[PDB]
Amino acid sequence: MTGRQARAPLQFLPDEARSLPPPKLTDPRLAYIGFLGYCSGLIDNAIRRRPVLSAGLHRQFLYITSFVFVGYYLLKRQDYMYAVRDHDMFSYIKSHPEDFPEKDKKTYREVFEEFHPVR
Amino acid sequence: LQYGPLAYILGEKTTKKMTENSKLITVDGNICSGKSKLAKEVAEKLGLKHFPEAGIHYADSTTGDGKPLPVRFSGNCSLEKFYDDPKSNDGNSYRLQAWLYASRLLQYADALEHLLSTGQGVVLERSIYSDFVFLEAMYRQGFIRKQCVDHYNQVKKVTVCEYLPPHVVIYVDVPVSEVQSRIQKKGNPHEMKITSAYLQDIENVYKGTFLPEMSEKCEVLQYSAWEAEDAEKVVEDIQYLKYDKGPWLDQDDRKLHNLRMLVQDKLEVLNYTSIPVFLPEVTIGAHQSDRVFQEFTELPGRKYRAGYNEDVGDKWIWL
Amino acid sequence: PFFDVQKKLGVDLDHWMTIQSAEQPHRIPARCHAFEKEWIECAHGIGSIRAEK
Amino acid sequence: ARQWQPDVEWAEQYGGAVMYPTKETAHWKPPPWNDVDPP
Amino acid sequence: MSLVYMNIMMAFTVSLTGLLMYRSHLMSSLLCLEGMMLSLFILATLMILNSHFTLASMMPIILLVFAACEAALGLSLLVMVSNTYGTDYVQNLNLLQC
Amino acid sequence: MLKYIIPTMMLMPLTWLSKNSMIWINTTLHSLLISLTSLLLLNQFGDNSLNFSLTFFSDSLSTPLLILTMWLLPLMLMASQHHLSKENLARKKLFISMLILLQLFLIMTFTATELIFFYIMFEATLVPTLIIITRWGNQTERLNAGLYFLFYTLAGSLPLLVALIYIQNTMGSLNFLILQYWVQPMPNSWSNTFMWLACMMAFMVKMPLYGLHLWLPKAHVEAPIAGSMVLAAILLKLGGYGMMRITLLLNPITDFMAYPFIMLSLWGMIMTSSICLRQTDLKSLIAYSSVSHMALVIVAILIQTPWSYMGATALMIAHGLTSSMLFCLANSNYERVHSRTMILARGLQTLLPLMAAWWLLASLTNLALPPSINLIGELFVVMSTFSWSNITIILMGLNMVITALYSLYMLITTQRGKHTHHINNILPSFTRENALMSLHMLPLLLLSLNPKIILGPLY
Amino acid sequence: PTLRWQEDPEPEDENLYEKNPDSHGYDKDPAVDVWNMRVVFFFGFSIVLVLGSTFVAYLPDYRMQEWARREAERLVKYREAHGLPLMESNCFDPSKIQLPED
Amino acid sequence: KFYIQEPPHGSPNWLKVGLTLGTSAFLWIYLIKQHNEDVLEYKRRN
Amino acid sequence: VVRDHWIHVLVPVGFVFGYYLDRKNDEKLAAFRNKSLLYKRELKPNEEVTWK
Amino acid sequence: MNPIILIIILMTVMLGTIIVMISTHWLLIWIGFEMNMLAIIPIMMKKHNPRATEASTKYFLTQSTASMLLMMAIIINLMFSGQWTVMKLFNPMASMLMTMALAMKLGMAPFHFWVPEVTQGIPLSSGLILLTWQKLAPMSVLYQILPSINLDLILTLSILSITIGGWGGLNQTQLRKIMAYSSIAHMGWMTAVLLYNPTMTLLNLIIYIIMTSTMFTLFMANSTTTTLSLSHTWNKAPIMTILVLITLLSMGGLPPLSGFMPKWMIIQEMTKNDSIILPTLMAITALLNLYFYMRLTYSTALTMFPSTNNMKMKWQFPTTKRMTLLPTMTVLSTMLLPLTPILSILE
Amino acid sequence: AKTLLHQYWDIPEGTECHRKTYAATSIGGASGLVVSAYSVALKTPTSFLEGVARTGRYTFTAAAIGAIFGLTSCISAQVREKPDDPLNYLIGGCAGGLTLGARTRSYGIGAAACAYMGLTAALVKMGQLEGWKVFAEPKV
C-alpha cells in the first residue's frame, strides 16, 4: 500500500501525528524495550570476557537510553500509521453507501439452521 | 587497541623506524651448543634486545604473571619424559613438538611485532625452521608415524606462508663428540640419558636440508665451533655485509601495515594451529577438556580478562 | 523502497531526461508531443488502474 | 564420566567436501584450511 | 514496425546465444558481450533518431561508455586468470566446486 | 493471571544471583510458594468461565492442568540432581532457568485466549525441550530422539497455523467466546475436510496415535528425568487440552470423517498395550503405557459426549501424575544400577524395604484401582464408547486385561524374587526419592477423596 | 600403535554415604542438606498439602451445585403446588417461534 | 604488579566514559522535553 | 531484615505487584458498571461504586 | 588495500545502492547496478589466492549478463510507450526479460549456480557485503515495478528457489555454502509475496539482513570455515556457543524466537487471498530448510566434539577482535517477537 | 503448457476417450523433453548418441506414465460411471507409479510412486472439481 496523497516526502512523522495522543511514558512496550536493552548490555559484557553485572554501567545506561529513545520514535510512527489507516477506511465507508448495505438482522425466531445430532 | 587503520591514516607511516639497527638476527645452533653465550654477547655488543629460548611455558611467561603454570595446563609435554623414554604409547614426542611449534610461533610473532614497532632490532634462537628440522630428524630416527609428520607438514604449509623470513642467520657448526662432551659435563641426568644417533640425524638434516632451503635468503654466517666468545668477528661480519635476497628489500608500507595488523590480536596468529586431522595421539577427549578448562578458570588471574579481574584489583569497575 | 530525497531536496536531477514534452535545450518539440501531453493530462492524478480503464 | 560424548569417528562423518558420498562425488577433496591454493 | 528493428533484435539474440554457449575460451565470450553491447547501442540509437527524442540522446553514449569500462574490468580479470595459470580456458576453472 | 505470569519471570534471576549451594533452596522454596498461590486460583463457577483479561482466561478444563503444571515444577526441580550435581555452576543454572522458562511458556499456553496465541506458545513449549534432552540425554541416540521429536511435532503441527489464519480472516477474531457464540456448521465439502484433517492431524501428531507414536519412546528412553516427566505429562495433556478447545468448531463433519481415527486409535491401543508386555528397557514400558492411555483419550475426545469429556480430563490428570511418578521410580532404579534394562536389576524386596510400597502403589494407580482417578476416567470413557457402539467394549476390556497384565508384570519383574548377588553397590533409599514419591502420590489420593475439581467443563 | 583418546579412566562411583552417615538425599554439605530437608517437608507438606486440603476441601459451591439443589427444591415445590407438570417440555415458548412454511 | 606487559585497557580511560555519560544524560533530557512538549501540543490541539 | 538477605523477598513482592496490576486492569475495564440486564440495582448507600 | 581506498570503495557501494533507490529514471538504475558491480569486485580478491580470482570471474560473467538483459528490457520498454519513468511497463516480454534479469541479479533456482561458488572462495567480509547489499538493492526496483509483472514468473521462480535452496544444502559441511543456500531460500520467501503485499517483502529483507549480520559476526569473532572449527570454538569460549545456538534456531524460524515474524506474517497476508496450497507447500519446505541449521547446532553447542590441544595455549589469549555490532544485532534479531505491530513502521 | 493442459481438461470426464490418452501422451512427452533438456545440459553424457539414448529413455518413460494414466482414467470412468469421485484418479496415479517402477525396474520405487502419484492425481482432480484457484487471485 502506497500514497495516499503523494506529495509525501521521506517524512518520518508528519505534523498531523501531533493530533493523536503521544505514547505515554512507562507504557509496557517501551519497558520491554528497556529490558531488551538491559539484556543487550548484559550480553555485551558477556561477549568480551569482562565480568557480567559490573564494569560497564555507563554502557548499560547508554544501551537503555538509546533503545528507549529509538523505540519511542518508532512507537509514535506506529500510532500514526494505524490512525491514518482507520481514517482512510472510515472515509471510504462514508463515501460509498451502495456496496455496503444494511444487513437485515433477522432474529432467531425465524432463522432456520440444520441440526445434525451427535448420537 | 593501540594500533589501528585510523592510526595509519592520522599517524604518518610505518617506515621511518628504519634501518641498519632494526633487523632480525637469528642464532641457530645444535642442542647444548647454540646457547646463551653468543646470543647474549651480540645482545650486549650490538645494542639489540634478546628474547629467551622458547621453553615449554613461554605462553605462561608472556602474559599475566611470570610464574609458570603447572603441567596440567601448559602441556601435557613432559620434556623430561621425552629425554628419558622417547618410544611411549601415550604419545609424547609429537604433543611436545606441536607445543614447541606454538611456542616458537608465538615468540617469533612477538619478535616480529617488536621489530616492526620502533625497533630496535632483535636476536632469536632456535626458530621455526629449526623446528621443522627437529621434526624431520625425529622422523629419521623413527619415533613418529609418517601420517603425523604429514600433519605437521600441513600445519607448516598453512602457518608460515604469510610471514616474512628473518634477515640473517648466524649458524654454529659443532661436531657430535663436542656436543656429547658438553652434555656429559653439564650434569642433567635426563639429558645424560640422550642418545647420539638422534644428534647425528639432527646435524645431517640441519646441514643437508636446512642450508640449501635457505638458498641465500636469510643470509647465513656458518661459524665454527670454537668461534665463540668472539664479539668483534661476529659484529664485524654483521656490520660488513649488504642484502640482496629476501622480500625485505621492498614492502614498502602496505605489507608492513598488514603484518602489524596481523601480529596484533594474536588469536589471528593462532587461528591455524588446530586444523585438525584427528591425530589419535593429540586430540583431547571431551571430559578432560571440560575439567581442565574449569580448573584453569579456578586460577585467580586467568579467569575473565585479567585487565578487569577482581581479587587482584583494580577497584575501578564502576561501583 | 522508493525514497524521495529527489523530491525533498528540490533538485531536478532526474526530471528532464525522463519524459517527452519537457524543456528541450532549444525549445523544440518531439514527434508525438501533443499525444503524450493529452495522455499525461488524462492520467495525472489517477491511481494507475482506472488510468488503464 | 557416564555421559556419552561423540567420539572421533562420529566427527569423521563430518569430513570431506560433501556429506553423502556417492559413486560420482568421491573426487570432492576438502578445501585447504588457509584458503590458499598451492602454485 | 520499422523492419530494421526486426533484424537488429535478431542480431541481439544471435549475440546472446554466442555469449551463452561458448567453448574453451573467455576472450571470445567477452567479445560477443561487446557485440551485444553494440546491438543495444544501435537499437536504442535508431529509436532515439526516429522519435526526435532529443534531450535523452545520452542513452547511447552513456550505455557504451559504461559497458566499455565493464569490458575493461573483464579484460583485467581475464589477464588475472591467465596469470594464475598458463592459459585462459573455460577448463582448469574446475576447482572451487559446487 | 498476570499475578501468575510475572513471578515466574521473577523466579528466573533468583537462580542467577543466588550464590553457590543456595540456588537450590531458594528455587525450591519459591516454586512451592508459587504452587500455593496457584491453588488459590480455583474460583470458577457455574455459568461462565473466568476472564483474566481479553488476553488471559480460564475454563475449568484449564484450571487443574494449570495447577498440575505449577505443582510439577518444584517436584521436577528437586528431581533433577544427582545426575548433574557434579556438573558446573553455569550449566546447572542454565538447566534450572530452562525449566523455569518452560514453565512460563506452559502457563502462556494453558491460559491462551486466542488460538493463534495458543499455537505460538504451543511451539514455544516445543523449543526448550530439545535443548534439555539433547544436552543431558546421557545416551548415544539422544540426537536421533530430539531430531525425530522436532521434525514430527513441527511437520504435523505446521498447517494448523494455515487453518487458524484462514479461520481468523473468514470469521473475525479468535477469542474462544467469539469463536463460540458465532460458530456456524460447515458442510461436507472437501476443503472443510482438509481443514479438519489439518487441525486434528496436528494434534494427532501431538498425542500421539498409533501411526505416529514412535515419536515418543526414543524421546523418553534417551532423555533426562526432567525432560521425560514434563514431556509426557504436560506436553501430551497440553495436546489433549488443545484438541478439546479447537473441536468446538467443525460440528457436522466429524461424524462423516472421524471414523478412521477412532479405528487407528483403538487397534493401536491394543497393539501398544501388547508391545509393552514383552520389552526390556524398563523406561520404555511407561512410554508405551502413555501411548495406550492417550489413544484412549483420543477415542474419548473424538466421540462427543459430556460423559466422554469428563472421563477424558480425569484420565488426563490421573495418567499424568501416574506416568510422571513411574518415570521417577525408573530413574531411581537407574541411579541404583547403571543398567536401563529390566532382567538385570532383580531382587529389591529384601533390600530397600520401603520402595516396594511406592512401586506397588504406583502400579495400582496404573492398574486402575477403583477409588482412584484413573479408573474414574477409564470408566466414563467405557460408558461413553458403549453408548457410541454396543460392540467396542470388547476392545476396552481387552485393553484393561492387558494393561493390568503388563503393569503387574513390570512390578513382579524388577522387584520380586531374588537379588542377582553380584550387584553390591546399591545404597539404602534416600529421603529425597521418598519425598518425591510422597509429593506424587498424596495429591492423587486426596483428589480421589474429592474429584469434583478435576472433572472439566461439563460438570 | 594407537589409542585415539587421552582422557581420564572414568568414573568413580560417588557413594554419597561414607562421609556423612546422618546424610539426607544429596551431597556432602552438612548444613544445607538439613535446610533442604526442612524446607521440603515444611513448605511442601506443612503449609502446602494440608492447607491446600483445607482450601479445596470447602470453598464456594463449585460450578453452582448446592444453589442448584436449593433452587430446584423451591421450583419443584412451586410447580407441584400449582397444578402444572414439573418440567414442561418445549423450553422455548411456541408463541415465540416462527417456522418456515411449506 | 601482577602483569608483565601491562594491559592496554582495564586501567580506566577518562574521555570515553565521560563522553558516554554526557551524551546519555543529554539524550534523556531531550526525549523528556520532547515528550512534555508533545503532550502540551496534544492538549492545545485538543 | 531486608538487606541481610534480600533474595527471598523477590517473588512475593512480584506476586503483590502482579495482583496490584490485575486490579489496575480491572479498574481499566470498568465499562458496563450497571448496564447488564441482570446485575442492575440502584446505586446505594454512599458513593458511586458496586465493584472495583 | 590502503584504508583510504577501502573507505572509497565502500562509499561507492553505498552510492550505487543509493542511486538505485533514489532515481526516477532507468539510466540511473542501470548505472547503479553497474557501479555496484564495479565496486563490489575488489571487495573480493582482498587476498590473492586463485579462489577469489575465479569467484570474481564467475560473479562478473553472471552479473554482467544480467545487467545487459536489464538494458535489453529497458530498450524494449522505450520501443513501446516511450518515457524513462520507473513505473508500470508496457510489454509482457519486457517485464519477462526484466524479471529474469533481476532474478539473475539476486539469485533464483535456475540462476543460483554462481552463489555458493562465489561465496566459497572469498573471505567473510566480502560475503557479508555482497549478501546484504546485493540482495537489498534490486528489491527496491522490484518494489517499484511490481504492478506490471506476470505472476507465473515471480511465483515459479520463488517456489523453485525455496525448494532448491532447501534440497541443495543438506549435503554441505562448509559454512559459506550453507549460508548461500539459506540466502536462496530467503530470496524465494521474499519474492513469493511481492504481488500481494510488498511491506512483507521489505520487512523480510530487514529481518534477513539482521540475521545474516549476526551470523557472519559470530563467524568473524573466530575464524571458522568448517564445523570442526565450530566445535573448537565451543571449547575456547562458551558464549559463542549459545549465541550460535540462538541465531541458528532463529534462522530456522521457531515461534518464540524472532525468526517466525517473517514467515507467519507472510502466511497471513498470503492467505487473506485464496492461496492455501502455496502457503502449505512453502512452509513445509521451510520445515525442510531447518535440518542443516539443526545439524550445525548439534555440531556446535549441544554435543561436544573432542578438541585438539593447543587450546591449552589459546586460553591465555582472549578474543580481542572488535565486533561490528554483535550484541545489539543479536538481541534485535532474536528477541523481537512481541513487536510484530512494528510491521506498520514501513508505509 | 497451458494449451495442452487445456486440451486435457476440455474433455468431459465423462468419456470422450483416447482423446484423453492422446493429450496425456502430449503432457508426458513435453515433461520428459523438459527433464531430458536439463539432464543433457548439466551432465554432457559423452557422447551424443548416448545423449539421444538418455533423451529417448526419459521421454519414453514419461510418455508411458502419461499414456497408462490416461488409459486407466478412461477405463475407470467408463466402468464406475461416476465422473465425480477422485478415486478413479487415485487408481490412475497408482497405475502410473507402478509403470514408473516397471521402467526403472525397482519395486519399492514403484510402490512409493504409486502412493504419491495417486494422492497428487486425486488432489488435482479435487482441485478442478471443487475449484481451487492455484497461484493467484491475484487480487485481495
Taking alpha carbons only, the member of J176, J94, J99 closest to residue J139 is J99
| Residue H12 DSSP one-character state | P
For residue J341, cis peptide bond before it (omega within 30 degrees of 0): no
Taking alpha carbons only, the member of J139, J249, J117 closest to residue J189 is J139
In this structure, the dihedral spanned by the alpha carbons of residues J101, J105, J111 and J114, taken in order and rounded to 10 degrees, is 150
In degrees and rounded to multiples of 5, residue F58 shows phi and psi of: -120, 120
The rounded Cα H24 to chain-centroid distance in angstroms is 1
Distance from CA of J137 to the nearest CA of C (A): 9
Question: Cβ contacts (< 8 Å) between G25 and chain F: which residues?
Answer: 82, 430-433, 435
Instruction: Return the bridge partners of B255, or none.
Output: none
C-alpha cell at J299: 555440531
Output the DSSP codes for chain G. ------S--------SSSS-TT--SS-S-HHHHHHHHHHHHIIIIITTHHHHHHHHHSSS-TTS-HHHHHHHHHHHHHHHHTSSPSS-S-SS-GGG------
J174, D17: Cβ pair inside 8 Å?
yes
Q: How far is CA F100 from CA B3, F11, F70, in A?
A: 46, 8, 10
C2, J25: Cβ pair inside 8 Å?
no
d(CA B235, CA B43): 10
d(CA H21, CA F208): 57
Taking alpha carbons only, the member of F102, F87, F340, F324 closest to residue F225 is F324
Query: Which of J79, J83, J86 should be substituted to probe chain C, the one whose Cβ sees the most C Cβ atoms within 10 Å?
Result: J83
> Any residues with CB less than 8 A from the CB of J187 and at least 6 apart, and which?
J106, J107, J108, J135, J161, J165
Three-state secondary structure of chain F: CHHHHHHHHHHHHHHHCCCCCCHHHHHHHHHHHHHHHHHCCCCCCCCCCEECCCCCEECCCHHHHHHHHHHHHHHHHHHCCCCCCCCCHHHHHHHHHHHHHHHHHHHHHHCCCCHHHHHHHHHHHHHHHHHHHHHCCCCCCHHHHHHHHHHHHHHHHCHHHHHHHHHHCCCCCCCHHHHCCCCCCCCCCCHHHHHHHHHHHHHHHHCCCHHHCCHHHHHHHCCCHHHHHHHHHHHHHHHHHHHHHHCCCCCCHHHHHCHHHHHHHHHHHHHHHHHCCCCCCCHHHHHHHHHHHHHHHHHHHHCCCHHHHHHHHHHHHHHHHHHHHHHHHHHHHHHHCCCCCCCCCCCCCCCCCCHHHHHHHHHHHHCCCCCCHHHHHHHHHHHHHHHHCCCCHHHHHHHHHHHHHHHHHHHHHHCCCCCCCCCCCCCCCCHHHHHHHHHHHHHHHHHHHCCCCCCCCCC
Helix axes F306-336, F236-246, angle to 10 degrees: 170
Return the CA Rg of chain J: 20
Q: For chain J, list the strands marked E by DSSP.
A: none
d(CA J249, CA J243): 10
Smallest CA–CA distance from G1 into chain B, residue: B89
d(CA F334, CA F190): 51
Three-state secondary structure of F23-80: HHHHHHHHHHHHHHHHHCCCCCCCCCCEECCCCCEECCCHHHHHHHHHHHHHHHHHHC
Return the CA Rg of chain I: 18
Write out residues 20-79 of A within 8 Å (CB-CB) of H: 20-22, 25, 58-59, 61-62, 65-66, 68-69, 72
Helix axes J277-288, J151-167, angle to 10 degrees: 30
Assess F389–I contact: CB distance below 8 Å, yes or no: no
Sign of CA dihedral I37, I42, I43, I45: negative
Taking alpha carbons only, the member of B203, B64, B235 closest to residue B133 is B203
Residue I13 belongs to domain spanning: 1-51
Query: Which of J218, J321, J324, J342 should be substituted to probe chain A, the one whose Cβ sees the most A Cβ atoms within 10 Å?
Result: J342
Taking alpha carbons only, the member of F321, F324, F278, F316 closest to residue F295 is F316
* Run of H or E including K101: helix K87-104
C-alpha cell at I11: 517473588
Interface of I with F (CB under 8 A): 7-8, 10-12, 14-15, 17-19, 21-22, 25
Query: What 3-state class would DSSP assign to B25?
Result: strand
Interface of D with B (CB under 8 A): 1, 3, 5-6, 8, 11-12, 32-34, 36, 38
Query: Which of G93, G96, G97, G98 should be substituted to probe chain A, the one whose Cβ sees the most A Cβ atoms within 10 Å?
Result: G98
Taking alpha carbons only, the member of J53, J135, J273 closest to residue E84 is J53
d(CA B298, CA B292): 10
**B165 near B214, Cβ under 8 Å?**
no
Taking alpha carbons only, the member of B274, B21, B283 closest to residue B159 is B274
SS3 content of chain J, % helix, strand, coil (to 5): 70, 0, 25
Amino acid at position B107, single letter: Q
Phi-psi region of G84 (alpha: psi -120 to 50; beta: other; left: phi over 0): beta
Distance from CA of A112 to the nearest CA of F (A): 12
The per-residue b/e assignment along F298-330, b for 16 or more CB within 10 angstroms, e otherwise, is: bbbbbbbbebbbbbbbbbbbbbbbbbbbbbbbb
In the sheet where B219-223 sits, what is the strand order?
Answer: B49-50, B122-125, B24-28, B168-172, B219-223
Query: What 3-state class would DSSP assign to B122?
Result: strand
**F435 near G42, Cβ under 8 Å?**
no
N-terminal to C-terminal alpha carbon distance within chain A: 51
User: Given J30, J60, J71, which is nearest E73 (Cβ)?
Assistant: J60
Distance from CA of C42 to the nearest CA of J (A): 15
Sign of CA dihedral B87, B88, B91, B97: negative
**K100 near K65, Cβ under 8 Å?**
yes
Distance from CA of E93 to the nearest CA of J (A): 7
In degrees and rounded to multiples of 5, residue K56 shows phi and psi of: -65, -35
**F254 near F266, Cβ under 8 Å?**
no
> Any residues with CB less than 8 A from the CB of B124 and at least 6 apart, and which?
B24, B25, B26, B27, B51, B107, B108, B111, B166
* Run of H or E including J69: helix J50-79
Task: Name all chains with 3 or more CB-CB pairs below 8 Å to chain E.
Answer: C, D, J
Q: How far is CA J300 from CA B4, J230, J289, J311, in A?
A: 32, 6, 18, 16
d(CA J324, CA J169): 28
Assess G79–F contact: CB distance below 8 Å, yes or no: no
d(CA J336, CA K21): 55
d(CA B257, CA B251): 10
N-terminal to C-terminal alpha carbon distance within chain K: 27
**B145 near B277, Cβ under 8 Å?**
no
Task: Name all chains with 3 or more CB-CB pairs below 8 Å to chain D.
Answer: B, E, F, G, J
d(CA B19, CA B21): 6
Sign of CA dihedral F306, F308, F311, F315: negative
Domain boundaries, chain G: 17-102
Amino acid at position J20, single letter: V
Taking alpha carbons only, the member of J305, J331, J334, B271 closest to residue A47 is J331
Amino acid at position E18, single letter: G
Phi-psi region of J299 (alpha: psi -120 to 50; beta: other; left: phi over 0): alpha
Taking alpha carbons only, the member of F347, F182, F325, F208 closest to residue F269 is F208
> Any residues with CB less than 8 A from the CB of A27 and at least 6 apart, and which?
A75
Question: Cβ contacts (< 8 Å) between J309 and chain B: which residues?
Answer: 76, 95, 98-99, 274, 282-284
Greatest pairwise CA separation for chain K in angstroms: 52
d(CA J123, CA K96): 49
Phi-psi region of B187 (alpha: psi -120 to 50; beta: other; left: phi over 0): left
d(CA F320, CA F454): 12
Helix axes F373-388, F431-449, angle to 10 degrees: 50
Taking alpha carbons only, the member of J246, J243, J182 closest to residue J209 is J182
Query: Which of A5, A7, A10, A88 should be substituted to probe chain C, the one whose Cβ sees the most C Cβ atoms within 10 Å?
Result: A10
C-alpha cell at F302: 473424538
Smallest CA–CA distance from B291 into chain J, residue: J235
Instruction: Return the bridge partners of B138, or none.
Output: none
For residue G6, cis peptide bond before it (omega within 30 degrees of 0): no
Looking up cell 553485572 gives A53
K140, J196: Cβ pair inside 8 Å?
yes
In this structure, the dihedral spanned by the alpha carbons of residues F29, F31, F37 and F41, taken in order and rounded to 10 degrees, is -160
Three-state secondary structure of J223-287: CCCEHHHHHHHHHHCCHHHHHHHHHHHHHHCCCCCCCCHHHHHHHHHHHCCCCCHHHHHHHHHHH
Taking alpha carbons only, the member of F362, F51, F344, F331 closest to residue F177 is F51
**B37 near J289, Cβ under 8 Å?**
no
J274, K135: Cβ pair inside 8 Å?
no
Taking alpha carbons only, the member of J188, J257, J200, J40 closest to residue J128 is J40
Assess K132–F contact: CB distance below 8 Å, yes or no: yes
> Any residues with CB less than 8 A from the CB of J1 and at least 6 apart, and which?
B254, B258, J46
Residue G76: how many CB atoms within 10 A of its CB?
Answer: 12
K140, J273: Cβ pair inside 8 Å?
yes
**J135 near J36, Cβ under 8 Å?**
no
Question: Cβ contacts (< 8 Å) between F186 and chain A: which residues?
Answer: none
**A39 near B294, Cβ under 8 Å?**
no
Distance from CA of H6 to the nearest CA of B (A): 8
**J290 near J253, Cβ under 8 Å?**
yes
Query: What 3-state class would DSSP assign to B168?
Result: strand
Distance from CA of G48 to the nearest CA of B (A): 40
Q: Can you list the alpha helix ranges (DSSP code H) found in chain B?
A: 5-10, 36-46, 58-61, 79-84, 93-116, 128-140, 146-159, 176-186, 189-192, 197-208, 231-239, 254-263, 286-297
**E64 near J30, Cβ under 8 Å?**
no
3+ Cβ–Cβ pairs closer than 8 Å linking I and C: no
Distance from CA of G28 to the nearest CA of D (A): 20
> Any residues with CB less than 8 A from the CB of A92 and at least 6 apart, and which?
none
Residue J242: how many CB atoms within 10 A of its CB?
Answer: 15
d(CA B83, CA B34): 18
Q: Can you list the alpha helix ranges (DSSP code H) found in E1-98?
A: 4-20, 27-50, 58-83
Looking up cell 611411549 gives B88
d(CA I44, CA I50): 8
d(CA F318, CA F377): 8
Assess G100–A contact: CB distance below 8 Å, yes or no: yes
In degrees and rounded to multiples of 5, residue F297 shows phi and psi of: -60, -40
Looking up cell 528431581 gives F79
Taking alpha carbons only, the member of F192, F169, F172 closest to residue F182 is F172
Query: What 3-state class would DSSP assign to C31?
Result: coil
Instruction: Return the bridge partners of B223, or none.
Output: B172
Query: Which of K2, K126, K134 should be substituted to probe chain J, the one whose Cβ sees the most J Cβ atoms within 10 Å?
Result: K134
Cα angle, residue G36 at apex, residues G31 and G41 outer, rounded to 5°: 130
Distance from CA of A86 to the nearest CA of H (A): 19
d(CA H12, CA A94): 66
**F228 near F216, Cβ under 8 Å?**
no
Q: For residue B127, how many C-alpha atoms fall within 13 Å in the half-sphere facing its CB?
A: 26
Cα angle, residue J290 at apex, residues J284 and J292 outer, rounded to 5°: 135
d(CA K137, CA B70): 73
Smallest CA–CA distance from E84 into chain D, residue: D39
Amino acid at position B25, single letter: I
User: Given B90, B280, B288, which is nearest G7 (Cβ)?
Assistant: B288
> Any residues with CB less than 8 A from the CB of F96 and at least 6 apart, and which?
F15, F23, F27, F77
> Any residues with CB less than 8 A from the CB of H28 and at least 6 apart, and which?
A65
> Any residues with CB less than 8 A from the CB of B285 and at least 6 apart, and which?
D5, G5, G6, G7, J306
d(CA J276, CA J279): 5
The per-residue b/e assignment along F44-78, b for 16 or more CB within 10 angstroms, e otherwise, is: beeeebbebeebbbbbbbbbbbbbbbbbbbbbbbb
Question: Cβ contacts (< 8 Å) between K126 and chain F: which residues?
Answer: 190
In degrees and rounded to multiples of 5, residue B64 shows phi and psi of: 70, -125
C-alpha cell at K92: 490412475
Interface of F with K (CB under 8 A): 189-191
Assess A14–H contact: CB distance below 8 Å, yes or no: no
Taking alpha carbons only, the member of F436, F457, F458, F441 closest to residue F81 is F436
C-alpha cell at B184: 656429559
d(CA J316, CA B58): 11
Taking alpha carbons only, the member of E76, F400, F198, F203 closest to residue J276 is F198
G62, F33: Cβ pair inside 8 Å?
no
d(CA F227, CA F133): 6
Total tally of structural domains belonging to chain I: 1
**B289 near J306, Cβ under 8 Å?**
yes
Distance from CA of D39 to the nearest CA of E (A): 8
Assess B278–H contact: CB distance below 8 Å, yes or no: no
Residue B151: how many CB atoms within 10 A of its CB?
Answer: 21
J273, K132: Cβ pair inside 8 Å?
no
Question: Cβ contacts (< 8 Å) between I6 and chain F: which residues?
Answer: none
d(CA B12, CA B257): 12
In degrees and rounded to multiples of 5, residue B221 shows phi and psi of: -135, 90
